[PDB]
Amino acid sequence: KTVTVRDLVVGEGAPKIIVSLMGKTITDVKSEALAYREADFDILEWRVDHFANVTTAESVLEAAGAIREIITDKPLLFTFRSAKEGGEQALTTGQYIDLNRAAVDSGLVDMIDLELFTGDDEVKATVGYAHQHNVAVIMSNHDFHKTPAAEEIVQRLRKMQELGADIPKIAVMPQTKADVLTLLTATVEMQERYADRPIITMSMSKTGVISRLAGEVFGSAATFGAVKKASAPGQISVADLRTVLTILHQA
Amino acid sequence: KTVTVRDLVVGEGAPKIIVSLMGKTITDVKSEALAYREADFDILEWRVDHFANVTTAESVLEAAGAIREIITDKPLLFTFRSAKEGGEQALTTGQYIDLNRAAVDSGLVDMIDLELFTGDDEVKATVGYAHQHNVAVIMSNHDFHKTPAAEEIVQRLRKMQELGADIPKIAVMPQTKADVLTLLTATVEMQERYADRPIITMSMSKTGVISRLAGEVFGSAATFGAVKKASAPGQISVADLRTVLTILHQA
Numbered sequence A, B: 001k002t003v004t005v006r007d008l009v010v011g012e013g014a015p016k017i018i019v020s021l022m023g024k025t026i027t028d029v030k031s032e033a034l035a036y037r038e039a040d041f042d043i044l045e046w047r048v049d050h051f052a053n054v055t056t057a058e059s060v061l062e063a064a065g066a067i068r069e070i071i072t073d074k075p076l077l078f079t080f081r082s083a084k085e086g087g088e089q090a091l092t093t094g095q096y097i098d099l100n101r102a103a104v105d106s107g108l109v110d111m112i113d114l115e116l117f118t119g120d121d122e123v124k125a126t127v128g129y130a131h132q133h134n135v136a137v138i139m140s141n142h143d144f145h146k147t148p149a150a151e152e153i154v155q156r157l158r159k160m161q162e163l164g165a166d167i168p169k170i171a172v173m174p175q176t177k178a179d180v181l182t183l184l185t186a187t188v189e190m191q192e193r194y195a196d197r198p199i200i201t202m203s204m205s206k207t208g209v210i211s212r213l214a215g216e217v218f219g220s221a222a223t224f225g226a227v228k229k230a231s232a233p234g235q236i237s238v239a240d241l242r243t244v245l246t247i248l249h250q251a
């Protein structure tokens, strides 16, 4: 029901805060890490798609090591967000899978992100590989154009569980206020019908910001905040995020 | 359309904060007003149903005057909540109308609360009477045990507009998380399709707390908070409420 990554217990208490580190070079990654020591979050997501030398394994490994040397007490989530799903760069399926396998091999990351629509066989294999190294998997899906029907959102989260995700995650784009409620409904329905582990959901953009602030009642276990710049539309500053989460938790 | 009550413009910007004052005697009322004086809220609601011998109009008017002497810069809302709607006591329809008209006549109150289910003839005439004296009307309905279907919530809010309410208000109790989303759905449908004035909606208890915070995005113009140290589930202190409402407004 819960997922423990280094003493952090996800799926219990107030929603956990994830922030994304985005750096093009190892120098930028180190500088950003140093700046992120001055923020209050629970999980550090390294957005590897922002890293220019992603196709050079040694460079990626060096950067992950550098982050770990600076940010020593926060779980590290390795995420290459594909351009197909709103990220900064496209890779072939093989390159993407091999990149995540290399992250797992490094022993420097606590979690990897795998995109649900990468391919079932590849996802299953990579989940197994991660698990044999005690690395957790956040499985992800995005719709940057619309909000699918609640039932479709629920079935995608359910499939993520079937594929072995430790934490299913979905982000959708509202076109109307009603779409924000559709995302919250899907979160509630997934919780009561299928979830046997934590899930993360969000409705993007300013229109959907309430979904990033109210996950405790509806069933989203974590939420993203912005340190200096948002890594997806709709994130608010991390200190304000903790403030709201705490107020709601004690309400 | 907005509703202006002494400089306060309801229906524009972040939702407004209403606090409720309860006292049995003029001494209780003075003590509470002194305690509330420095708190950060927008409208002071006096819950007259908690006051003793309300059928003695003169004692009620003396208490209203006492409040106005202490709280000089906040709009004052006069609310007799009937027992049938979760209040402390009952009055005949005639006594209730006379009490509210006496409040209008005093010049001490900026708004009165009229319950939708009081009866159409009496309500509409008293709305006219209040308007004749430049007193705004919040028309209210409450269900402390359950949440009506979204369609019924919308119907009630539409009827309040039809009867001439300046601000339709509904508060309902969720039994499930889905009930909270039902209340938000009704708020969105009402505000986007039928509303031509500010509306106030709320889902009670801790489960419904989102409804006190998301007024700007779903269409509720005000929320209720606590001044008092000790509060109830779902009720947020006014300082914390202002903090969250501002964070959402500035997101």
Ligand SMILES: O=C(O)C1=C[C@@H](O)[C@@H](O)[C@H](O)C1
Pocket: A020, A045, A047, A079, A081, A142, A171, A202, A204, A224, A231, A232, A233, A235
């Ligand atoms: O909606 C969000 O806040 C995000 C979703 C994921 O794609 C993350 O990888 C991204 O960095 C932030």
Ligand SMILES: O=C(O)C1=C[C@@H](O)[C@@H](O)[C@H](O)C1
Pocket: B020, B045, B047, B171, B204, B224, B225, B235
């Ligand atoms: O739940 C609350 O905090 C309240 C809501 C409104 O009905 C107010 O009229 C009532 O006095 C208190």
Ligand SMILES: [Zn+2]
Pocket: A105, A133
């Ligand atoms: Zn190995």
Ligand SMILES: [Zn+2]
Pocket: B105, B133
């Ligand atoms: Zn007159």
Ligand SMILES: [Zn+2]
Pocket: B145, B146
């Ligand atoms: Zn009942």
